[PDB]
Amino acid sequence: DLRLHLLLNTSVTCNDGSPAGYYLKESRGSRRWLLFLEGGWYCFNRENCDSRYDTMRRLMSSRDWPRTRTGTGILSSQPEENPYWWNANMVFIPYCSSDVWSGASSKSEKNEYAFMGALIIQEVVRELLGRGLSGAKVLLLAGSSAGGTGVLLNVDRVAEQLEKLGYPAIQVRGLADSGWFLDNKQYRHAPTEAIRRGIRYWNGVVPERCRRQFQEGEEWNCFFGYKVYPTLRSPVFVVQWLFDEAQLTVDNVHPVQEGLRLYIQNLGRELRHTLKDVPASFAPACLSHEIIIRSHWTDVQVKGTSLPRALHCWDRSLHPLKGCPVHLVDSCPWPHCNPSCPT
Ligand SMILES: CCCCC(=O)N(Cc1ccc(-c2ccccc2-c2nn[nH]n2)cc1)[C@H](C(=O)O)C(C)C
Ligand SMILES: *[C@@H]1O[C@H](CO)[C@@H](O)[C@H](O)[C@H]1NC(C)=O
């Protein structure tokens, strides 16, 4: 089990002002550290956040968090469940800031809620250095859904923080699962508008090079993987279903006739196109919401290679390899044309 630690700097808070924190299981024989960002949507104004506080309070507050959690999938310590990194130091960071991990704003006389996701990540890293992170050779920042977008927004800032603090030997890398979205046209008739409003409500921050390209008022562009990815310096592995259920939901897709058939086929082709220049990627032709912390994450394969294998090949590449591929994108055009898709 992973054990809860509330942050020692109690001014780094969840939405309601309670302390943020992390769950930790140390592995003293290992120099690998996996830090995983939870997902779970976001909220973007007072009324929308008030609703979330009524029925999704664990995503806004630490007051009711349990003392332990079990690691599953890529967070499992059992070799049979996690062929990739079963011996690593494991960290699960709960998502309690409702800001896609981008905020840097405290509760105040003018602010009902605090949005501190970007500061939570920095403070977890700083407190872990005294618990063994100072001896790491690799820090993998991973996450699913809003946490996967959070990886894209924060991996280079973690790298720069460790450099400025005096730890140049730690190699920082990212793993973004189910956080790679398209700002496309809906099938029936606003996510880009909600993100734009959220950034202003949260005092949200984006990576520096991407901010300088798009400039003031246009920082919402940096929440879209295909636009922010080319600006990043740290190595990033991208995992994305070609027919992701969250993408189809915001596109208003729920005996399929010609117009919808063409829409779905075009969505898969567009997603595949955005990954052409992403050398480390895993993108199966499936309709799914399933994520990399699920216990059966080993079962899906693209071109005969599982995700745990592809991640191992990626590690080797950062020391093309014969029989050890890292770029795995399905080419078949309809959900479940890959026989290994989750049932
Ligand atoms: C063009 C941007 C696409 C990304 C996007 O709009 N997002 C928010 C969201 C919220 C709620 C739902 C949702 C609503 C009702 C019912 C089911 C779902 C759902 N959620 N997952 N599957 N279905 C979908 C997306 C991302 C996410 O959090 O996914 C963030 C990171 C920007
Ligand atoms: C605690 O966190 C706050 C908010 O990020 C920061 O301003 C402050 O300097 C921190 N205090 C210490 C002692 O690290």
Nearest CA to ligand 2 atom 10: 9
Chain centroid to CA 243: 17
The two three-digit tokens of residue 304, written as one number = 């005969």
The residues, any chain, with a CB within 8 Å of residue 263's CB and separated by 6 or more, are: 187, 251, 253
Radius of gyration of the chain (CA): 19
Chain centroid to CA 242: 17
The two three-digit tokens of residue 196, written as one number = 């734009």
Chain centroid to CA 74: 13
- Tokens 């011996």: give the residue: 87
Measured CA to CA, the distance from residue 18 to residue 262 in angstroms comes to 48
Which ligand approaches the C-alpha of residue 20 most closely? 2
- Kind plus residue range of the DSSP H or E element containing 143: strand 138-144
- Cβ distance 324 to 311 under 8 Å? no
Half-sphere exposure in the Cβ direction for 213 (13 Å, CA): 14
From residue 105, give the alpha-carbon distance in Å to each of 53, 60, 213, 220.
Answer: 18, 14, 24, 17
3-state DSSP assignment of residue 221: helix
From residue 264, give the alpha-carbon distance in Å to each of 92, 130, 224, 290, 333.
Answer: 34, 49, 20, 19, 9
Q: Which atom of ligand 2 is nearest to the CA of 122?
A: 5
Strand pairing report for 305-306 and 301-302: antiparallel
Phi, psi of 59, deg, nearest 5: -85, 10
Q: Is 287 exposed, middle or buried (0-12, 13-18, 19+ CB in 10 A)?
A: middle
3-state DSSP assignment of residue 134: helix
The residues, any chain, with a CB within 8 Å of residue 206's CB and separated by 6 or more, are: 102, 153, 219, 222, 223, 228
3-state DSSP assignment of residue 282: strand
- Cβ distance 252 to 258 under 8 Å? no
Q: Which residues are catalytic?
A: 145, 244, 289
Measured CA to CA, the distance from residue 7 to residue 4 in angstroms comes to 10
| Method used to obtain the model | X-ray
* DSSP single-letter state for residue 229: G
Domains in the chain, number: 1
Strand pairing report for 2-6 and 68-69: antiparallel
Nearest to 251 by CA among 179, 169, 182: 182
Measured CA to CA, the distance from residue 162 to residue 169 in angstroms comes to 9
From residue 197, give the alpha-carbon distance in Å to each of 43, 204, 276, 332.
Answer: 10, 10, 31, 37
- For the chain, give the longest Cα–Cα distance: 60
CA geometry: angle 91, 168, 144, nearest 5 deg = 30
Nearest CA to ligand 2 atom 12: 9
- Cβ distance 264 to 253 under 8 Å? yes
The two three-digit tokens of residue 308, written as one number = 């745990």
Q: Which atom of ligand 2 is nearest to the CA of 104?
A: 5
Ligand 2 and 11: CB distance under 6 A:
yes
Ligand 2 and 9: CB distance under 6 A:
yes
Residue 95, Ramachandran bin (φ over 0: left; ψ between -120 and 50: alpha; else beta): beta
The residues, any chain, with a CB within 8 Å of residue 59's CB and separated by 6 or more, are: 40, 41, 52, 95, 96, 98
- Tokens 């740290």: give the residue: 234
Measured CA to CA, the distance from residue 5 to residue 21 in angstroms comes to 6
Nearest to 85 by CA among 192, 173, 162, 212: 173
Residue 245, Ramachandran bin (φ over 0: left; ψ between -120 and 50: alpha; else beta): alpha
Amino acid identity at 130? G
Measured CA to CA, the distance from residue 155 to residue 237 in angstroms comes to 12
Domain residues for 190?
1-343
3-state DSSP assignment of residue 22: strand
- Cβ distance 307 to 144 under 8 Å? no
